Structure 1
Amino acid sequence: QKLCERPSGTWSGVCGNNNACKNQCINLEKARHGSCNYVFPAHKCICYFPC
């Protein structure tokens, strides 16, 4: 709901892989979903924390 779409607390960078980005994010930190979202410049491991 009130999620903040931070580049993952850990993986604060380029992703090239949605599944991993998601997994790694919520596996290491405790965010809800994550995904290898686009937007300029390149894809990055965006993750949704209940901020």
Structure 2
Amino acid sequence: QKLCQRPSGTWSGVCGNNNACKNQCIRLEKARHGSCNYVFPAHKCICYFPC
């Protein structure tokens, strides 16, 4: 198991707080993790799934 990233699901916008959208992913789209991943040109909450 590692973490695979997936931006779309519950997230749409900017990455406000790591823990916030992490939890949001896990609750909504049911990810394992989620954080501000720096994709050009700005941090977005990318949800991390177990892969």
Q: Count matched residues.
A: 51
Distance 2:50 2:25 in 1: 13
- Residues 25/15 of structure 1: CA separation in 2 closer, same or farther (3 Å cut): same
Cα RMSD over matched residues?
Answer: 1.8
CA contact (8 A) 1:8 1:25 kept: no
Q: Deviations over 1:15-47 (max 9, x none)?
A: 121011101110112111111222311110111
Structure 1 runs not aligned, ≥5 long: none
- Report if aligned partners of 1:8, 1:45 keep a CA contact under 8 Å in 2: no
Higher strand share: 2
Runs of 4+ that moved beyond 2 A: 1-4
Identity %: 96
Using the alignment, how far apart are the partners of 1:39 and 1:24 within structure 2?
19
| TM-score normalised by structure 2 residue count | 0.74
